[PDB]
């Protein structure tokens, strides 16, 4: 029906919804060979599956061994993503299974719909929302667990830490996407903003620093300014 | 030969018999169509002059009985009926010709077009798709929906085509998700040809019938079915050699017969670009590709 405001607010209704982002599933470095050619080497990746209401992140680590001896890896990655998401849903009790799965790239729709035929009441769809989940691997603790894996692995995080003790799920999602858009736009400067004060620490069981309410306001301001500064630099505004 | 007499022509109408059509004026002296071959399958179709909404018609086979047309002023359409008294029927048709108020079928037997378009179409299979057991002939019109469409509102007035759905458990084996979606050979060969149709001739029969219902009646669900049945073959890496070669002939005559002014409404650009240029069987449709390129270059 399209009130951005109603679609955005409605993400946080009590229907269970998962975002699926596959942009870090198939990852490579690009390096020159001895014969003067150029070669890719795959590195571990991950599926990012997030419940935006609760912050629960199902991080399926994609180990490089799954590509071995396969062809057309960009295509296969979509199907592998769909296979794992389907498996995740089947592993959940019925009352925890999503009513909608929202893929951040339209190319995921057919693979997931085909792997989800056993769940005809689960809606699969894309979104007009530009989301910055490709920057998930800028989160140091996520990147560390992906890069250290020697085998396929599923790791559960709460990407909102303890924020829901104090703000809503639409506010936490807004904070999350602001942080990730800043890390995508200027990663090293975004990390500086977050780590500049050594007396504010990241708890062992958290991803982000233990900012007070007023410090988060300040941090959010500095991220907005980071994004706006980069816009101006890019477009000569 | 056989004859389809008309009692009268009370309303102005375009009448088609197989691939031929002519006009009849309101209350013109017209008592039907003569000198048509017995032998196989035919279609008589109508589009009223004062209301080109609802095209409709009847598939029939001379050999199954004596058929005639009578306008029904209550329902407002030309209706097919069967005469079970053959002597009476011979008595009429041996005279109405004697009158010469009938139009002849022409057959310039160089033309084999009708047989090329209906080679695999059989009346008894038509009657399974169009369910009306009390009549030997089958009514189709522009508005009738398919059973598959209905699954997405009167099941009696529907076209019971075989459901083809590429994203359905029938088309996809658990554990072969990517394989079966990207190579539909399992769905074509095991499910459709060995499970449902039994042979390729029955498959081609429904494809030909679907095309003809789309062309003759502008039936949209029939067009959907035609394109689906083509795309299923073309999207399969493994297809018998005979079936591929026969598909090229079937499609060639269908594209050849299509009205040129009807290509925006009867040809799906997506499906034809996949089949001719991006599918496993692209290089197996040589004659169809040649008539499509030269006849309808805009679509491609
Ligand atoms: C914030 C914003 O402007 O846009 C909202 C929006 C767009 C799409 C969806 C969705 O569910 O797909 C949700 C929200």
CATH number at residue B269: 1.25.40.550
Q: Which of A76, A83, A114 sits opposite B172 (nearest CB)?
A: A114
* Distance between CA atoms of residues A66 and A150, nearest Å: 12
Of the CA atoms within 13 Å of residue B282, those in its CB half-sphere come to: 8
Chains A–B, number of C-beta pairs less than 8 Å apart: 23
**B33 alpha-carbon distance from chain centroid:** 20
Residue B38: count of CB within 10 angstroms of its CB: 10
* Distance between CA atoms of residues B200 and B163, nearest Å: 16
Q: Which residues, 6 or more positions from B237, have their beta carbon under 8 angstroms from its beta carbon?
A: B183, B185, B280
Which residues make beta-bridge pairs with B43? Answer: B59
* Inter-chain touch B167–A76, beta carbons under 8 Å: no
* Distance between CA atoms of residues B250 and B208, nearest Å: 8
Domain that holds residue B268: 116-299
**B183 alpha-carbon distance from chain centroid:** 28
Which residues make beta-bridge pairs with B81? Answer: B68
* Inter-chain touch B177–A76, beta carbons under 8 Å: no
Which of B121, B117, B115 lies closest to B202, judged by CA? Answer: B121
CA dihedral B261, B264, B265, B271 (to 10 degrees): 130
A85 and A101 Cβ atoms separated by less than 8 Å: yes
As given in the structure block, the two tokens for residue A62 are 């994609």
> Among all residues of chain A, which has the CA nearest to that of B182?
A111
* Distance between CA atoms of residues A58 and A131, nearest Å: 17
As given in the structure block, the two tokens for residue A140 are 């140091």
Which of B96, B105, B140, B138 lies closest to B8, judged by CA? Answer: B96
Q: Which residues, 6 or more positions from A155, have their beta carbon under 8 angstroms from its beta carbon?
A: A59, A61, A145
3-state percent helix, strand, coil for chain B, nearest multiple of 5: 45, 20, 35
Q: Which of A83, A113, A118 sits opposite B167 (nearest CB)?
A: A113
Q: Which of B169, B172, B177 sits opposite A79 (nearest CB)?
A: B177
DSSP E strands, chain B: 2-5, 13-17, 20-24, 32-36, 42-48, 51-60, 66-72, 77-83, 103-104, 138-141
DSSP E strands, chain A: 17-21, 27-32, 38-43, 45-50, 56-62, 100-103, 123-125, 153-158
Using a CB-CB cut-off of 8 Å, the residues of chain B touching A79 are 177-178
In the block, residue with structure tokens 């890496």: B237
Domain A164-237 has CATH 1.20.80.40: yes
Which of B229, B225, B223 lies closest to B258, judged by CA? Answer: B223
Using a CB-CB cut-off of 8 Å, the residues of chain A touching B168 are 117
H helices of A56-204, in order, are: 73-91, 109-115, 140-148, 169-185, 187-195
* Distance between CA atoms of residues B116 and B254, nearest Å: 9
* Distance between CA atoms of residues B277 and B235, nearest Å: 11
Between CA B27 and CA B36, with CA B33 as vertex, the angle to 5 degrees is 170
What is the enclosing helix (H) or strand (E) of B247?
A: helix B241-257
CA dihedral B252, B183, B185, B204 (to 10 degrees): -20
* Distance between CA atoms of residues A84 and A22, nearest Å: 11
Residue B137 main-chain phi, psi, to 5 deg: -115, 160
Say how many residues make up chain B. 300
What is the enclosing helix (H) or strand (E) of A213?
A: helix A213-235
The CATH number of domain A9-163, selected from 3.30.70.20, 3.30.420.230, 3.40.630.30, 3.40.50.920? 3.30.420.230
Taking the Cβ of residue B177 and every Cβ of chain A, the question of whether any pair is shorter than 8 Å is answered with yes
* Distance between CA atoms of residues A23 and A26, nearest Å: 7
* Distance between CA atoms of residues A204 and B295, nearest Å: 70
Experimental resolution (Å): 1.7
Beta strands B2-5 and B13-17 are unpaired
Which of B113, B116, B149 lies closest to B222, judged by CA? Answer: B149
| Residue ranges, CATH 1.20.80.40, chain A | 164-237
Method: X-ray
Residue B85 main-chain phi, psi, to 5 deg: -85, 95
Task: Print burial letters for A152-170: b (CB count within 10 Å at least 16), e (below 16).
Answer: ebeeebbbbbebeeeeebe
């Amino acid at each position: 029906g399209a009130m951005n405001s109603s679609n955005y607010a409605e993400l946080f209704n009590n229907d269970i919804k998962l975002f699926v982002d596959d942009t870090n599933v198939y990852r490579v470095t690009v390096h020159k060979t001895f014969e003067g050619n150029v070669a890719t080497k795959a590195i571990n990746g991950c599926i990012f599956t997030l419940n935006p209401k609760t912050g629960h992140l199902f991080l399926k680590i994609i180990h490089t061994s799954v590509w071995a001896g396969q062809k057309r890896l960009s295509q296969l990655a979509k199907w592998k993503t769909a296979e794992e998401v389907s498996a995740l849903v089947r592993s959940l009790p019925k009352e925890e299974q999503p009513k909608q799965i929202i893929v951040t790239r339209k190319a995921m729709l057919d693979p997931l719909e085909v792997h989800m035929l056993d769940f005809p009441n689960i809606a699969i769809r894309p979104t007009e929302l530009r989301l910055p989940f490709s920057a998930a691997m800028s989160i140091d603790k996520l990147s560390d667990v992906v890069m250290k894996a020697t085998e396929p692995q599923m790791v559960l995080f709460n990407i909102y830490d303890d924020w829901l003790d104090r703000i809503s799920s639409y506010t936490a999602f807004s904070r999350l996407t602001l942080l990730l858009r800043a890390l995508k736009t200027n990663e090293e400067s975004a990390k500086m903003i977050l780590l500049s004060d050594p007396t504010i620490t990241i708890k062992s069981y958290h991803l982000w620093p233990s900012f007070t309410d007023e410090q988060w306001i300040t941090i959010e301001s500095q991220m907005r300014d980071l994004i706006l500064t980069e816009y101006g630099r890019k477009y000569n505004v | 030969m056989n004859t389809v007499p008309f009692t009268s022509a009370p309303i102005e109408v375009t009448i088609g018999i197989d691939q031929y059509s002519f006009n009849v004026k309101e209350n013109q002296p017209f008592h039907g169509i003569k000198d048509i071959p017995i032998g196989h399958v035919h279609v008589i179709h109508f589009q009223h002059a004062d209301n080109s909404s609802m095209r409709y018609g009847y598939w029939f086979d001379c050999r199954m009985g004596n058929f005639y047309i009578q306008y029904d002023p209550k329902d407002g359409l030309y209706k097919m009926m069967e005469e079970r008294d053959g002597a009476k029927f011979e008595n009429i048709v041996h005279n109405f010709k004697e009158r010469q108020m009938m139009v002849s079928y022409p057959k310039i037997d160089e033309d084999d077009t009708w047989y090329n378009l209906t080679e695999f179409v059989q009346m008894d299979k038509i009657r399974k798709i169009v369910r009306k057991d009390e009549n030997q002939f089958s009514y189709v019109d522009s508005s009738m929906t398919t059973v598959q469409e209905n699954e997405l509102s009167d099941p009696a007035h529907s076209l019971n085509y075989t459901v083809i759905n590429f994203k359905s458990r029938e088309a996809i084996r658990p554990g072969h998700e990517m394989e079966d979606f990207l190579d539909k050979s399992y769905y074509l060969n095991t499910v459709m040809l060995q499970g449902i149709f039994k042979n390729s001739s029955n498959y081609f029969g429904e494809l030909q019938f679907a095309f003809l219902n789309a062309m003759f009646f502008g039936n949209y669900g029939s067009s959907l079915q035609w394109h689906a049945m083509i795309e299923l073959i073309c999207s399969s890496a493994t297809v018998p050699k005979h079936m591929l070669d026969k598909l090229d002939e079937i499609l060639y005559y269908q594209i050849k017969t299509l009205p040129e002014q009807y290509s925006d409404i009867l040809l799906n650009e997506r499906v034809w670009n996949i089949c001719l240029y991006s599918s496993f069987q692209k290089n197996s449709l040589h004659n169809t590709e040649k008539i499509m390129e030269n006849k309808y270059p805009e679509l491609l």
